[PDB]
C-alpha cells in the first residue's frame, strides 16, 4: 500500500509500504528521497511520536494515512 | 512578512488533524491555538489551549509558545512555559507553526522526566510514574475538558 | 495535472523563505536554499542545516543553477 | 505543451550519458552529473568538470536530490 | 532582442540582447544561466569563432539567430 | 551500443546544424560520414570538406577519431588529413558531442594557429607570406573542396 509523508516544507511525498514495515524502514525511504538521516527524523501520527521498533500495523496505519515529519525534539 | 502569510494560509486551507491555529484579528504575529491530547497518553481526550507568538526575527528565531490550559507534564511548569529544544537551541528556520505544534503534541506523547524543568513533576514521574499518569489524566478531565 | 505541477513548484521551494529559489545554493549535506536565506542562517561563518542539522560553512556554498532554471521554466508554464 | 516539457527534461539531463539523472551529484563548480558518470570521469580521485573544466575531487561530491525528485515527477507526468 | 544559444548538451537557452552588445556581454549572460566562465566559452556562428571585442551587429546576428556553444579549443 | 551514441545520432538526424552533415554507416554506427562547410570570411568559404569520424569504445570518456578525407591547406592539418586539436586529445571533454567536435573543427578553419604547427611547411608560409597562403587555401578549396560531393 501507499502512505503519505508531509515533509518539513509541507510537501507530501508518497511511499510504497507494507503493514509489517518498521518505522525505521519508513525513515530509510524518507532518507532516500529527502536526505534526512533517520537519527534526525521523527514521524507523528495521531499526535504520537512513532518509535523505531514498532510497525505501521501496530499503530493502525492504513492505506492513504498521512504521517507528519518533524525534527528530533527533546523536552529535557 | 510573506512567510507568515503563506504559513497562515496553509493553516486555514490545508489543516492538520488535532491542531487548530488561527491568527488574532488584532495581531497576525499572535496565534490562538488548540492542541488535542495524543491518544494512548494521559492527556487523551484533552483540548489544550496554547499561545503562539511569532517574534520579528522569525523564521531565524523560534516562536514563543506557552500553555494557557493547566497541564501536568515534566517539561511544562505552572506558568505554562515549555522547555523544548526545538523552541530554543535546536530550533530550525525550516520549522513552521504546523511542525512546532506537532512537536509540542509529540512531547505530550513522549515526556522526558529524567532531565527536569518542573522538578516536582519530573521526580514524581520517575519515582511514581503510575501516580503521575493518574494525576495528568485527572488534570486533563478537570482543566482540559469543557474549556472550549 | 495541477497536482503534479504544484509538486514541481514545491521541489523548487526554499525551506526557509517558502518562496521559489533565488540564487539557489547548496551546503555540504546537499540540501539547497536561497543564498541570502542560508547566508543569514549561517551569518558568522556557518551553522547547521535547517533540514538535517548537519554543520555547514558559508565558504563551502555551491551554486545549484539547475534548480534556478527549473524555476524560470515553471514561471513560463503558468501565466 | 511538449516544448516546455522538453526544456525541463533537458535541465534534468546528464551532460555525460545524456539520460535523465540517476543519483544526481554535484562537484565544486556546482555542475551536476550522474554519480556513476562523474565517478568514471574522475577515476583516480579527481579530474576536470566536463562542462567548465574546473578541477574537482571525487571526495567532494554532493547529492542533488531536488534534481532527482524533479526527474521522477516529470517521468510520472508523461504517464 | 532574443537570440538562441545551443549549449553543450544541445539544450537551447533564450537570451535578451541588443545588437550593440559585445560577445563578452553574451558570454556573461550564458555564464549566469549555465555557469561556464567566459574564458571557457567559445561561440560559433556561421562556422566562425566569434571574438570577444566585436558586437552582434559586426556579425549580422539578428533576432532569433542561434549561436552554438563550444569549449576553449586550440589548433596546434 | 552505448545509448549516448544512439541519442547523439538521433539528434544529429532530427535537429540538424547549419553547415554540418554527419550520417552513420549502415555497417558500423561508430563510423560517421561527415561533410563540413568551410566557415564564411575564411579562405575555405564555399568549400565542402569530407571528414571521417569514428567513435572508439571508451566514448564519451575518450575523444572521437576524426581525420579529413578532402585535401585542405591548413597549418594544423597534415597531408593525411590528421588534425592536431586539443579537444581531440588532452583538452577533450566527455560533455563534447559529435556536433560540438565538428563545430570545433569548423572553428579551427576560421582561426588557424601556425605558431604550434602540424604541417610545418604551411605554417611557415602562413607567417612568412600570409596573403599567398590564403590565396593557395582559397584555390585548394575550389580545386579539391568543390564538386567533391
Ligand atoms: Zn529562501
Ligand atoms: Zn541538510
Ligand atoms: Zn549520466
Ligand atoms: Zn563545472
Author numbering:
A (entry chain F), E (entry chain D): 1 to 76
B (entry chain E): 5 to 152
C (entry chain B), D (entry chain A): 3 to 81
F (entry chain C): 4 to 152
Lines quoted from the article behind this entry:
These properties of indirect targeting and ubiquitination allow TRIM21 to inhibit infection by a diverse array of pathogens, including viruses, bacteria, and prions, by causing their proteasomal degradation and activating immune signaling. Antibody-dependent virus neutralization by TRIM21 is dependent on interaction with its canonical E2 enzymes Ube2W and Ube2N(Ubc13)/Ube2V2(Uev2). Here, we have described a general E2-specific mechanism of RING E3 catalysis, in which a tri-ionic motif provides conformation-specific anchor points that capture the Ube2N~Ub closed conformation.
The structure was solved to 2.8 Å resolution with two full complexes (2xT21-R and 2xUbe2N~Ub) in the asymmetric unit. The overall domain orientation shows Ube2N~Ub in the closed conformation primed for catalysis bound by the two protomers in the RING dimer. The generic interactions present in our structure include the Ube2N S96 sidechain, which forms a hydrogen bond to TRIM21 P52 carbonyl, and Ube2N R7 sidechain, which forms a hydrogen bond to TRIM21 I18 carbonyl. The TRIM21 linchpin-residue (R55) contacts Ube2N (K94 carbonyl) and ubiquitin (Q40 sidechain and R72 carbonyl) simultaneously. However, we were particularly struck by the prominent involvement of three anionic residues: E12, E13, and D21. The tri-ionic motif is perfectly positioned to capture the E2~Ub specifically in its active, closed conformation, providing ideally distributed anchor points.
